[PDB]
Amino acid sequence: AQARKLVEQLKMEANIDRIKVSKAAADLMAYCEAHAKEDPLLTPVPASENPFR
Amino acid sequence: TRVFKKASPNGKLTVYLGKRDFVDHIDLVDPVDGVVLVDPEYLKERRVYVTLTCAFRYFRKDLFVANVQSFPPAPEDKKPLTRLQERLIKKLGEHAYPFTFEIPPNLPCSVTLQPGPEDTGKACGVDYEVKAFCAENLEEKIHKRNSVRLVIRKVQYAPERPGPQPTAETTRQFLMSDKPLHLEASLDKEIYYHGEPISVNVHVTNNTNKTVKKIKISVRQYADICLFNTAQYKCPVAMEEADDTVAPSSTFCKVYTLTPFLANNREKRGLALDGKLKHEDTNLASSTLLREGANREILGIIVSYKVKVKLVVSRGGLLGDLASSDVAVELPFTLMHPK
Amino acid sequence: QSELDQLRQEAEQLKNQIRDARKACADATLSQITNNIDPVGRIQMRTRRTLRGHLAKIYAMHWGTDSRLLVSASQDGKLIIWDSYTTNKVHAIPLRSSWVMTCAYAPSGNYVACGGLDNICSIYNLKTREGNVRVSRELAGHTGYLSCCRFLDDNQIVTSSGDTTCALWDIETGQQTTTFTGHTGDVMSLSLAPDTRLFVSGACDASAKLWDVREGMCRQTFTGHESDINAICFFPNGNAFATGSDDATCRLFDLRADQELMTYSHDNIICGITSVSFSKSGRLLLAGYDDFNCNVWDALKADRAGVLAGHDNRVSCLGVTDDGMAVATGSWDSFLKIWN
Amino acid sequence: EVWVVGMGIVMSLIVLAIVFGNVLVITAIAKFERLQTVTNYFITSLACADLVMGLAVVPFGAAHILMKMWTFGNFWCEFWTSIDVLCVTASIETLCVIAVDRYFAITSPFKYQSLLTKNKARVIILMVWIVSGLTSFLPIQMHWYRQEAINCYANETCCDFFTNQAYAIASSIVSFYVPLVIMVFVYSRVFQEAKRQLQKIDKSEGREHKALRTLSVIMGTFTLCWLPFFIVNIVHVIQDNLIRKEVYILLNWIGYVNSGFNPLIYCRSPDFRIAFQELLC
Amino acid sequence: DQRNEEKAQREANKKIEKQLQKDKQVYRATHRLLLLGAGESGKSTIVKQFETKFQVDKVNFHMFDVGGQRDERRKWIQCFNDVTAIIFVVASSSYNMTNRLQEALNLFKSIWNNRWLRTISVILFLNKQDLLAEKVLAGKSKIEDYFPEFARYTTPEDATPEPGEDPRVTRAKYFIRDEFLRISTASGDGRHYCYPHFTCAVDTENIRRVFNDCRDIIQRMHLRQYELL
Ligand SMILES: COC(=O)N[C@H](C(=O)N[C@@H](Cc1ccccc1)[C@@H](O)CN(Cc1ccc(-c2ccccn2)cc1)NC(=O)[C@@H](NC(=O)OC)C(C)(C)C)C(C)(C)C
Ligand SMILES: Cc1ccccc1CC(C)(C)NC[C@H](O)c1ccc(O)c2c1OCC(=O)N2
């Protein structure tokens, strides 16, 4: 009966409307590089106001 | 294309198969698919059954035997008509009845041990036979004419993982390693292809209070082979000498290239070789994947490789010199064909 | 056997449809979109703070939403709330069970949870009446050991377990409102989302499964790994997530595309992954390792921006402040290193 | 001639060797946090004791030997002798302390961890160092160690160690012989325990060899370095006209080498050696 | 104000540091223990004679029963490596059956060969020795033929002068112990060892046996550290 629940689980993911990887990758890269002028992990020491040093 | 047919004798029961080099990359293996052609003009036995055997040898201490009944449709299984079989049915005609052997991970690679001169009549090692027969009963002796075998091999190729750089270091030993004396031998990579040299670098320091003689770089073959219980074997593959120039307080940083090749180890007894279909001139044995690096449990032939670096001291007297005064390290590597 | 064979046939057909959908997103890979981005400046983060207050090894940690207070759980029965700025202690909480594999910090900074082999996800009330922090309402617990738990809010919490089922709790009543089942092996970690409406969970079945907290339908299963998934964290856009694995991989998945975007490796690393996190923009995909080091992977180049050091043991936890100001590494050496 | 120049190079080599070894082990301890351990505190104290001598005793003694005319003065003669005695006594007593620590870690295994903590280790180390100070710098700098040398000590060129019998016996038994007895008992006990463990292993999983090859390095290098010196001291104090100044100095110097050997004796373990190799670049 | 806040924070830091130094002092003196088994293997009276704090000879120990042990045992193995021993219970009357003895051997090999457990020594306990004797006295089941490895391991030359025994029982006991001894000597790490020991339904002695084996483990670890062994 486990396969009967497995087919129900796969049915929910069998009706998806996924998008192509070109649009997804372009959107991800563009968006998460546009809102990227804050990260102090990269671009270290934004100013003397580095709170941990 | 070029399906390999065998044309079993008496003009009956021809068997066709695809590639005879079924591949086991790390785990999982291509099923042994094909079509057996049986003309139903006699039907004396009314039952044709094809079997696959992983028999080990030098008789026939078998490993895994499976049987398939195919003259009746055998409605229990519904294996799809393979890409080869879809056209094979049309090519062979009406009497093309398919067969497929889906083999789980059961037996190791088909590695045949090197026969000795005046000690070779048949193959000796691990091989698959794939017998076919037409018998009414289950285990009656067919032999005779309508019995056909077809030697197939399972081989493993190079995985897409170079691996780390093998390193080792030893520091002390009986009345030999006393003042600082360490070996920092390393390797280049973990995957090598047959006929391609392997290089090793040494970083001995010799800060000791006694001199050391020339080193001896060697390649070992750790062929773990046994059927009844377990055993272990270790035979040389290639070796190279060195020079007697290491002085106290001198960091020798030489590099050496060794090429394991079969042109010289022709007379070595027990040197494992890759699968031989019919007494052919094969290559050296390729190292196997040891139970996907998770189980370390085997039931057949294991071939593994490791280099060795030995150092001589040439002790000089009675001050506790005549003892175990040799330092050595071992670096494993996997020597495989590429694909 | 007819029913089982039919079920297997439909499962094979559904798998064929799923792989067809995944492969239909082949207009490109992240190699055509790999150019025009300047290579990241070599990231050599230096330990700004070394939090040395724990006795036993460390498993998990979670920064507060104020980007100041970080919690940490140990096997000495201690759950210490540090002040990352002043490297001091604020609260140390004894645990009823010595072994714990998780901890969390409430989004409002009011509660802190834990959990471990005791099958108990104890919730603590930091804003006490007049004294030490008390165990508020120990959740009933699943049939397997708890692995990770994160807060939806102060009133709702979602927990993961080794019982193959994650569940969404309700601290007010203490009883599960819904339970998410469908995995095969033990669930190792989960991660919420910026919209706080969906969460995934990578299990021993080597399959990251997206979950919807409304009715519990596993909308998409993000398979692709060969070893069990140890840790997952959502992308800052709430649109992707990177899953670490024992096979030294850090494959990134996309919810919209529903397949792998990268596989992260260096052909030298053989140890698995212990924890994963992202920077504010997600460009610095962080990753701990079993070989006492942490490698900072670019989200687009797949080449490490730098390698961490220090901890002489498995780095079992990894976090980034909500403000992204710095990252915090914890390991089995009972020392928390803060890498600016 | 060639004797003086030949000594001039070997003394320099030995002082650089001891200084470099001790400073290398001290930096290895200081660099990695994983190198901080309860026994590593004793190792660090021993390294400091054997290191301070490397820079403040060996060069001055080498200068005296090369040119036996102490021009540094009559006060720096006394100060140098004081730090000489302090450094050697601290080295021997720290060898004894490390030995007794390893003895307690075997005879009292369940009590070792809560008996020898960081506070207890610091108290023990301070108590050993202050005992060394109380017999090196109080007597020498306050002149409780003193007929033939009455004119020499007044003469501001000669710094020759003419210690009276009382201070000679007291300093010898305080610095070397008592730690020798303690370390002998300690290592007899640990050798017996190792033999018993080997016997248990042989009886259970069986299908002297290893204790000797470590006991020898730990309990015989220090012996062959110091014991001849600390017996020639009693020989030359009990009765004169027995040993000469040159042989006295030679035994002293062959004793000086254990403080440069002991990083190798007490730090050839992979956990510290990994950090040591990490210091290569 | 801000200085006052910093002073208050420092006072809190000191208070927690002291209350945690006390915990460290009491924690270092307590050595952990892993109480293991195979379900119905016989970890029944051992857990009482899942916290099991007990102090023998003025040193405290506590064993932690794993609980359930559904599958993928390595998931919770990764936490139990700071312990000093793994009290692993073995059924020794389940030779016939599944082959629960073979499953116990396999899981013992798994525990032995984990990389994160490649330092922690496991103490054995072959339970149901009275049940083993009762089973072997009649011998309706083949003594060990279900485990066909018994074909040459007859007399290990290890004398067992225990009174009220039987030679077949002693031979079977030696085989069963060696079944784990081979796996123990397979990996020569030198830090973790094996302590195969006999138990019973009526034991009344393991309160001393676990203490002695833990003492041996600690001494062996210290000896390995100091290079004396
Ligand atoms: C890691 O090695 C070391 O650190 N050993 C060095 C070492 O033992 N070197 C010499 C001997 C020596 C010892 C003390 C002062 C000066 C010189 C070795 O070249 C000779 N030694 C031969 C030797 C034999 C006996 C003894 C001995 C005898 C009585 C009392 C003390 N030692 C000394 C040296 N060789 C050995 O291979 C073994 N040495 C040893 O002691 O063997 C048991 C080891 C290895 C076990 C250390 C030093 C301590 C000196 C650095
Ligand atoms: C100054 C000079 C002149 C010639 C040769 C050598 C030296 C240098 C000296 C003798 C000062 N080294 C001190 C020597 O290492 C030493 C060590 C520990 C002791 O307990 C004592 C001790 O001296 C005897 C003693 O009474 N106690």
CA gap C68, D154 in Å, rounded: 70
Cα–Cα distances (Å) from E100 to C70, E111, E134, in that order, read: 47, 16, 18
D200 with E181: Cβ contact below 8 A: no
Question: How far apart (Å, rounded) are the C-alpha atoms in residues D232 and D215?
Answer: 25
Q: What is the domain-level CATH number for residue B78?
A: 2.60.40.840
Q: Which are the contacts of D29, defined by CB distance < 8 A and separation ≥ 6?
A: D35, D36, D40, D43, D44, D47
Q: Which atom of ligand 1 is nearest to the CA of D257?
A: 15
On whether the CB atoms of residues D168 and D237 are closer than 8 A, the answer is yes
**Which residue type, as a one-letter code, is found at position A30?**
A
**Is position B161 within any domain?**
no
Q: Does C have 3 or more CB contacts under 8 Å with A? A: yes
Distance, in Å, from the CA atom of B246 to the CA atom of B252, rounded to the nearest integer, reads 7
Å from CA of D86 to ligand 1 middle: 27
Q: Assess whether B132 and B212 both reside in one domain.
A: no
% helix, strand, coil for chain E, step of 5: 45, 15, 45
Which C residues 16-75 touch E at CB under 8 Å? 53, 55-57, 59, 75
- Which CATH number covers residue D113? 1.20.1070.10
D22: annotated binding-site residue? no
**D19 CA to middle of ligand 1, Å?**
21
Q: Which amino acid is at B196?
A: E
Q: Does E186 count as an annotated binding residue?
A: no
Buried b (16+ CB within 10 A) or exposed e, C286-318: bbbbbbbbbbbbbbbbbebbbebbbbbbbbbbb
Q: Are both B117 and B259 inside the same structural domain?
A: no
Provide the resolution (angstroms).
Answer: 3.2
**What are the tokens at D241?**
């006209």
C-alpha to C-alpha distance for C226 and B160, rounded to whole angstroms:
14
Sign of CA dihedral E53, E54, E60, E64: negative
| Number of domains into which chain C is organized | 1
Alpha carbon distances (Å) from E201 to C172, D172, E85, E161, E180: 47, 62, 22, 21, 21
D231 lies in which domain range? 2-278
- Which ligand is nearest to the Cα of residue D257, counting in written order? 1
Q: d(Cα C30, Cα A29) in Å, to the nearest integer?
A: 10
Rounded to whole angstroms, the Cα distance separating B138 from E148 reads 29
Rounded to an integer, what is the distance from CA E118 to the centroid of its chain?
A: 14
User: Which pair of structure tokens corresponds to residue D220?
Assistant: 């015989």
Which residues, in sequence order, are CB contacts of B269 under 8 Å at separation 6+?
B114, B116
Query: Could C218 and A13 be called an inter-chain contact, meaning their C-beta atoms sit closer than 8 Å?
Result: yes
Index of the ligand 2 atom closest to the CA of residue D80: 11
**3 state SS for chain B:** CCCEECCCCCCCCEEEECCCEEECCCCCCCCEEEEEECCCCCCCCCCEEEEEECCECCCCECCCEEEEECCCCCCCCCCCCCHHHHHHHHHHCCCEEEEEECCCCCCCCCEEECCECCECCCCCEECECCCEEECCCCCCCCCCCCEECCCEEEECCCCCCCCCCCECCECCCCCCCCCCCCECCEECCCEECCCCCEEEECCECCCCCCCCCCCEEEEEEEEEECCCCCCCCCEEEEEECCCCCCCCCCCECCEEEECCCCCCCCCCCCCEEECCCCCCCCCECCCCCCHHHCCCCCCCEEEEEEEEEEECCCCCCCCCCCCCCCEEEEEEEEECCCC
What's the CATH number for E29-217? 3.40.50.300
Q: Are strands E86-91 and E122-127 parallel, antiparallel or unpaired?
A: parallel
Burial of B47 (0-12, 13-18, 19+ CB in 10 A): middle
Please tell me the distance from the alpha carbon of residue D74 to that of residue B301, in angstroms, as a whole number: 82
Tokens in use for C223?
A: 């398979």
Domain count, chain D: 1
Looking at residue C78, which CATH number applies to its domain?
2.130.10.10
Atom of ligand 2 nearest to the CA of D145: 26
Determine contact: E60 vs chain C, CB below 8 A: no
CA of B36 to the centre of ligand 1 (A): 76
**Are residues C235 and C286 in contact, defined by beta-carbon separation less than 8 angstroms?**
no
Phi-psi region of E159 (alpha: psi -120 to 50; beta: other; left: phi over 0): beta
Which neighbouring-strand residues pair with C198?
C212
DSSP state of E1: -
Of A7, A22, A23, the CB nearest to C11: A7
Sequence-separated (6 or more) residues with CB below 8 Å from residue D52: D83, D87
| Residue D216 alpha carbon to ligand 1 centre in Å | 8
E-state strands within D5-46: none
Query: Of B178, B210, B319, which is best to mutate to test ligand 1, by the most ligand atoms within 8 angstroms of its C-beta?
Result: B178
The answer to whether the Cβ–Cβ distance between C333 and D34 falls below 8 Å is yes
Are B121 and B214 found together in one domain? no
Structural domain of B28: 1-155
**Structural domains in chain A, sorted by start:** 1-53 (4.10.260.10)
Contact, C18 vs C288, CB < 8 A?
no
Helix (H, G, I), strand (E, B) or coil at E90: strand
Short-list B126, B116, B121, CA closest to B61: B126
Token output for D273:
């050696």
Tokens of C278: 């992202």
E130 known member of a binding site? yes
Q: Are C40 and C51 in contact (CB under 8 A)?
A: no
Q: What is the DSSP letter of E116?
A: G
Binary contact (B164, C270; C-beta < 8 A): yes
Q: Where does residue E11 rank: exposed (0-12), middle (13-18), buried (19+ CB within 10 A)?
A: exposed
CA-nearest residue of chain E to C101? Answer: E79
β-strand C146-151 against C134-135: which pairing, if any? unpaired
Q: Please give the residue range of the domain that contains residue C268.
A: 2-339
Residues of E with Cβ-Cβ distance to D207 under 8 angstroms:
181, 185
Q: Looking at the structure, do residues B201 and B147 belong to the same domain, yes or no?
A: no
Experimental method: cryo-EM
The C-alpha atoms of residue D51 and residue D260 are separated, in whole angstroms, by 8
- Tokens coding E110: 């798994």
Closest residue in chain B to residue D269, using alpha carbons only: B171
Q: Are C338 and C311 in contact (CB under 8 A)?
A: no
Closest chain C C-alpha to B162 CA, distance in angstroms: 6
Contact D106 E184 (CB under 8 A): no
Q: Are residues B196 and B122 in the same domain?
A: no
Say if residue D74 carries a ligand binding annotation: no
Q: Which amino acid is at E35?
A: L
* Assigned token pair, E33: 């223990």
Reported as type and span, the H/E element at residue E124 is strand E122-127
Q: Are B4 and B17 in contact (CB under 8 A)?
A: yes
Tokens of D215: 């006991």
Taking the CA of D61 as reference, the closest ligand is 2
User: Do residues C9 and A6 make contact, with C-beta atoms less than 8 angstroms apart?
Assistant: no
Taking the centre of ligand 1 as the mean of its atom positions, its distance from the CA of residue B35, in whole angstroms, is: 75
Into how many domains does chain B fold?
2
Nearest to B300 by CA among B113, B50, B97: B113
CB B336 within 8 A of CB B284: no
Residue B253 within a domain: yes
Based on the fold, state whether residues B269 and B145 are members of the same structural domain: no
Q: With an 8 Å Cβ cutoff, are A29 and C33 in contact?
A: yes
Give the residue carrying structure tokens 């300093």: D171
Closest CA to C243 of C232, C253, C234: C232
Q: Are the C-beta atoms of C200 and C232 separated by less than 8 Å? A: yes
Sign of CA dihedral C166, C171, C176, C177: negative
In a domain, B175, yes or no: no
- Nearest C-alpha neighbor of D48 from the set D76, D21, D75, D72: D21
In a domain, B121, yes or no: yes
